[PDB]
Amino acid sequence: NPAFPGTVTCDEREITVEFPSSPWHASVVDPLGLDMPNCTYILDPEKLTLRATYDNCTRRVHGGHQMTIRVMGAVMYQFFCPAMSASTICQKDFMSFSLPRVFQMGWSIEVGDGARAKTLTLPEAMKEGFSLLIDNHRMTFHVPFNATGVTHYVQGNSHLYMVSLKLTFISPGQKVIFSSQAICAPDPVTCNATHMTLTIPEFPGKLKSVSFENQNIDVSQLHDNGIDLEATNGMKLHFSKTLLKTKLSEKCLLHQFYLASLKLTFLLRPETVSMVIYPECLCESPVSL
Numbered sequence: 001n002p003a004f005p006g007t008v009t010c011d012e013r014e015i016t017v018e019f020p021s022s023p024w025h026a027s028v029v030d031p032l033g034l035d036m037p038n039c040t041y042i043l044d045p046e047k048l049t050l051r052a053t054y055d056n057c058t059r060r061v062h063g064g065h066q067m068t069i070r071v072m073g074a075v076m077y078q079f080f081c082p083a084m085s086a087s088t089i090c091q092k093d094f095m096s097f098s099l100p101r102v103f104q105m106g107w108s109i110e111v112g113d114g115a116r117a118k119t120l121t122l123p124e125a126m127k128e129g130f131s132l133l134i135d136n137h138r139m140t141f142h143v144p145f146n147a148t149g150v151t152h153y154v155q156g157n158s159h160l161y162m163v164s165l166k167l168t169f170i171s172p173g174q175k176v177i178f179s180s181q182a183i184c185a186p187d188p189v190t191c192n193a194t195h196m197t198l199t200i201p202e203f204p205g206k207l208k209s210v211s212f213e214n215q216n217i218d219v220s221q222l223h224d225n226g227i228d229l230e231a232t233n234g235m236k237l238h239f240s241k242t243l244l245k246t247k248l249s250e251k252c253l254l255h256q257f258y259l260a261s262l263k264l265t266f267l268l269r270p271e272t273v274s275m276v277i278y279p280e281c282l283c284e285s286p287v288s289l
């Protein structure tokens with residue numbers, strides 16, 4: 001019932017509860033107040049923290065996890081930790097993430113890996129091109145291709161930008177951490193009379209799945225669906241035009257074959273990452289006035 005004077009941090013796997021300094025004793029319980037049987041948590045008297053994984057220490061609720069604690073006459077607090085699209089939104093000009101709304105607010109971004117990893121506060125991150133747009137029902141985190149720490153691969157005219165990101169949403173007394181790798185191949189499109197071809201420079205990830213028009217296809221099945229893959233010296237993916245839609249752009253005198261949206265799911269041996277692209281064959285003849 002009372003507001004919790006400490007701070008809570010939600011991560012992908014565990015929640016950490018920090019208490020303020022007082023010259024405290026806490027336990028993990030269910031909403032009724034009884035010790036959870038299978039919950040194992042860690043107390044750090046030096047850091048004044050309680051740490052627990054979501055499994056076995058929280059109840060699964062709509063859109064996240066809920067933990068209840070008891071403090072000692074005997075006050076009880078509850079915390080909500082959101083469950084957090086790993087798919088990268090890949091466009092010709094930048095990368096972005098579309099995320100469920102979390103709960104004016106601040107944020108921080110960590111860019112890179114290990115030693116190269118660097119942390120930025122809102123000023124420096126925005127100065128570098130990062131932005132967070134809190135629209136209704138979801139949030140958008142804007143990642144520029146040319147931010148420091150982005151790996152830039154090139155093969156011919158196709159480019160690939162890859163970077164590891166640890167985004168921290170900051171609100172008074174709460175922090176939510178989202179981690180993912182952003183991967184975008186802007187301008188990978190190639191077309192001829194009969195096919196559309198997507199070329200991506202060679203990089204550690206290797207293709208595992210393709211999704212388009214709510215159809216999920218593993219690599220092994222691609223050939224039986226009019227899609228052929230060449231994985232040597234980078235990715236070259238050929239879609240038959242009979243699977244694509246057709247549209248008439250207002251700047252074009254002829255129809256363009258295109259896909260409404262294409263999701264490419266790659267496997268890096270540690271983790272699986274996805275990118276969503278919006279590929280279309282180039283206009284043949286423009287409108288001239």
Ligand SMILES: *[C@@H]1O[C@H](CO)[C@@H](O[C@@H]2O[C@H](CO)[C@@H](O[C@@H]3O[C@H](CO[C@H]4O[C@H](CO)[C@@H](O)[C@H](O[C@H]5O[C@H](CO)[C@@H](O)[C@H](O)[C@@H]5O)[C@@H]4O)[C@@H](O)[C@H](O[C@H]4O[C@H](CO)[C@@H](O)[C@H](O)[C@@H]4O)[C@@H]3O)[C@H](O)[C@H]2NC(C)=O)[C@H](O)[C@H]1NC(C)=O
Binds near residue numbers: 192226228238
């Ligand atoms: C537009 O661009 C597209 C994309 O590249 C072109 O379509 C592809 O053209 C290439 C080159 O001709 C084709 O590869 C050749 O395939 C033949 C025989 O194909 C069989 O073996 C393939 C390999 O396993 C297999 O993928 C095929 O199945 C697909 O393709 C057929 C059409 O070919 C289609 O009907 C099916 O439904 C599948 O989609 C099929 O089983 C093969 O003999 C060729 O090998 C020779 O050449 C290579 C080098 O290219 C050489 O290494 C070999 O030793 C041998 O000498 C070659 O592999 C490919 O199949 C076409 N399709 C796709 C999806 O990529 C298209 O031609 C372009 N059009 C124009 C107008 O330019």
Ligand SMILES: *[C@@H]1O[C@H](CO)[C@@H](O)[C@H](O)[C@H]1NC(C)=O
Binds near residue numbers: 037038
């Ligand atoms: C903990 O989980 C195991 C496995 O699901 C279950 O068998 C057990 O009853 C649970 N509770 C305790 C107290 O072990």
Ligand SMILES: *[C@@H]1O[C@H](CO)[C@@H](O)[C@H](O)[C@H]1NC(C)=O
Binds near residue numbers: 038053055056
């Ligand atoms: C949670 O409990 C299940 C069984 O109920 C057990 O299999 C699993 O290993 C536990 N996870 C953690 C993180 O303790």
Ligand SMILES: *[C@@H]1O[C@H](CO)[C@@H](O)[C@H](O)[C@H]1NC(C)=O
Binds near residue numbers: 127128129146147
């Ligand atoms: C490249 O980065 C600088 C600052 O980091 C930014 O001003 C510029 O707009 C970026 N490039 C593009 C094409 O936006």
